[PDB]
Symmetry: C3
Subunit: 210 residues, 3 copies
């Protein structure tokens, strides 16, 4: 039964910055898998990096397992976008008679949920824009502004987002996607950790036989 307790908020002794995300969550519509961590700058909670997240819009932030999320990473949800049909000025916010110009959901340029897969490495000070989907095993370069979807096992960076490269061949990627090591039982993961780390996919497929 090796490995840390995923219910541990601070799984590293002496370290007051790095947090397992899941057991810190208190707000709704934030769904984060076990072992995924946030390496905070100064002890701030992961939740406070999630911005413009309003119940009435009801968009969700979804993050898988074994993700590495760097310090200062922020998640921009759908509340951040104004109506763009005419004036972008949010008259309704100021009330005093203007509250009747409250936008309907259909009026807003909603983009849907932010969905981050498993085993994703997000660099320092990354900004994630509304509705973005990030595939399994992707790597987001430091200081990136993720303005569009990211394919699984690809490396991207920049502002706006640029494609850097695929981590592996298309065939190897499909093998990792078929395997889904993150969904294996922890006992199986533990026994297979050397191959998960060194990327020996062919070996994992053999252990795959049972």
């Amino acid at each position: 039964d090796h490995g840390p307790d995923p219910e541990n908020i601070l799984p590293i002794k002496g370290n007051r910055n790095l947090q397992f995300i899941k057991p810190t969550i208190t707000n709704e519509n934030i769904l984060v898998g076990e072992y995924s961590y946030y390496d905070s700058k100064r002890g701030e909670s992961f939740e406070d990096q999630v911005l413009y997240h309003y119940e009435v819009i009801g968009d969700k932030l979804i993050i898988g397992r074994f993700c590495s999320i760097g310090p200062g990473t922020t998640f921009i949800m759908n509340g951040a976008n104004h109506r763009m049909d005419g004036s972008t000025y949010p008259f309704h916010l100021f009330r005093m008679g203007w509250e009747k110009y409250m936008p309907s959901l259909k009026d807003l340029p909603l983009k849907g949920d932010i969905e981050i897969g498993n085993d994703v490495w997000i660099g320092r000070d990354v900004t994630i824009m509304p509705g973005v989907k990030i595939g399994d095993g992707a790597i987001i370069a430091a200081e990136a502004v993720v303005t569009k979807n990211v394919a699984p096992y690809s490396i991207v960076g920049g502002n706006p987002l640029k494609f850097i490269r695929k981590r592996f061949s298309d065939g190897v990627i499909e093998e990792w996607l078929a395997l889904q090591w993150w969904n294996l039982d922890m006992k199986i993961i533990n026994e297979n950790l050397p191959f998960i780390i060194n990327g020996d996919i062919e070996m994992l497929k053999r252990k795959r036989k049972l």
Copy 2:
């Protein structure tokens, strides 16, 4: 009808969102009514204006009904070093080096930052010296504005990239001719439904011009 533009904190229970105009204390900054800054921590809009020096005499001008996102910063002309030879600012250190004080003519001055009306500036935008941003423009979050921005266009990136024009050229000229932001508030209130949904055709009719 509508809020008081002289009220610093026009949203009940909100201590971050400020009407900018009544917070201005400095010369060489002009901001139009109803334009607001949604601060991160309650910092003032003036705290976001950097390298702005009286001796340089550059100005920051912002129109009416602008939306300015958290952490937006305005870089004025004091930020640039002399570039004819070494960029090192010897004069700062005195002890004999003060006689190398630069002339304003020796500096790469870019002029005023001028932002139009009904402009929406995203979170954490950086605006570089001498930039002009036209009416109705939209600046994407985290953008670094390094060149002028055409009216009613959307832009973003570092360096700044053109994303798209919001409307057709003909429509844009209609908005620029209309200038609803300069109308009396009584007339604005009457036309708010169309100002908001962009029914420029109704707005034209409602104006009742010498057609």
Copy 3:
């Protein structure tokens, strides 16, 4: 004449601008005289050097007379994860996982960060591992330096883009042959007017004189 390069705070009223070299307490950080960091709040230059681990042994090297803007950060080689398989750093959590501590040969190490002399680094610049920046370069504000920078060039953006060369190739070669930053301070002072106003012809005649 000029300030004492051992003075941490060489400007009288100023609590933010620090000469870097005398503040350095760490190993593997080598910074030349007169190079300064104009801090945001008051932090130290070393606070801006991140993921710098003795076990990696990489070095941050900065020449003389560099101007480093506020919020500039230096990302050392400790910031990169192993990329052969999962990027997840199991070893950090121990409880049995300490066995999987990665070795140096399994890491994507990029080498030392090396910044030349007379380099101007703008506000809020990020410097990635293994980057080399040549003498006299200028790094635009908010840039993310993702690759090497030629001497006497201007670059900016995220990722980094080439803007332009500061001078003609012939002039750049003359500045590089000159290396004024390496001359004795008596000679520096004597030639400060020409170093500052970019009179490279004069500097060249002066150099030929005592060669």
